């Protein structure tokens, strides 16, 4: 079973990436299962809804009383050294919140880190249906 652990916000970096203090260790965390428009995307640069998805994540974590990380059951860091987790802001999952606002798409998943994939696909379908932001 998955469990949430405490972390401390250091700095939000993008819509899908935040830097946290985890177990006395400064780390960059990549949000599991979501692809958000980017402001600092390798080739494309600043994509549409990038600043929005970025401001949303930032607001959500910065105004939180408690930040928690929940690792899935597969590997916990990607090839770039980024922790792969579901991030919770005062009990609300940032990953799902972005998808629900149409500020993110559910990422292509196959590997063992897929526990909340269905839940996210449900929020994305709702967001699409409501024609929100990315889906407008």
From Swiss-Prot:
Active site: 30, 38, 82
Domain of life: Bacteria
Record's compositionally biased regions (Basic and acidic residues): 116-132
Residue numbers spanned by region Disordered: 116-136
Residues at which Ca(2+) binds: 16, 35-36
Localization per Swiss-Prot or TrEMBL: Secreted
Protein known as: Nuclease A
Taxonomic path: Bacteria, Bacillati, Bacillota, Bacilli, Bacillales
Gene of this entry: nuc
From-to range in the entire protein, with total length: 88 to 223 of 231
């Amino acid at each position: 079973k998955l469990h949430k652990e405490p972390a401390t916000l250091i700095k939000a970096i993008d819509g899908d990436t935040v830097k946290l203090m985890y177990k006395g260790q400064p780390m960059t965390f990549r949000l599991l299962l979501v692809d958000t428009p980017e402001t600092k995307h390798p080739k494309k640069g600043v994509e549409k809804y990038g600043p929005e998805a970025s401001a949303f994540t930032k607001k959500m974590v910065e105004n939180a009383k408690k930040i928690e990380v929940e690792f899935d059951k597969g590997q916990r860091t990607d090839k770039y050294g980024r922790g792969l987790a579901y991030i919770y802001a005062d009990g609300k999952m940032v990953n799902e919140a972005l998808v629900r606002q149409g500020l993110a798409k559910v990422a292509y998943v196959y590997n063992p880190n897929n526990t909340h994939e269905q839940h996210l696909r449900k929020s994305e379908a709702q967001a699409k249906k409501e024609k929100l932001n990315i889906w407008s």
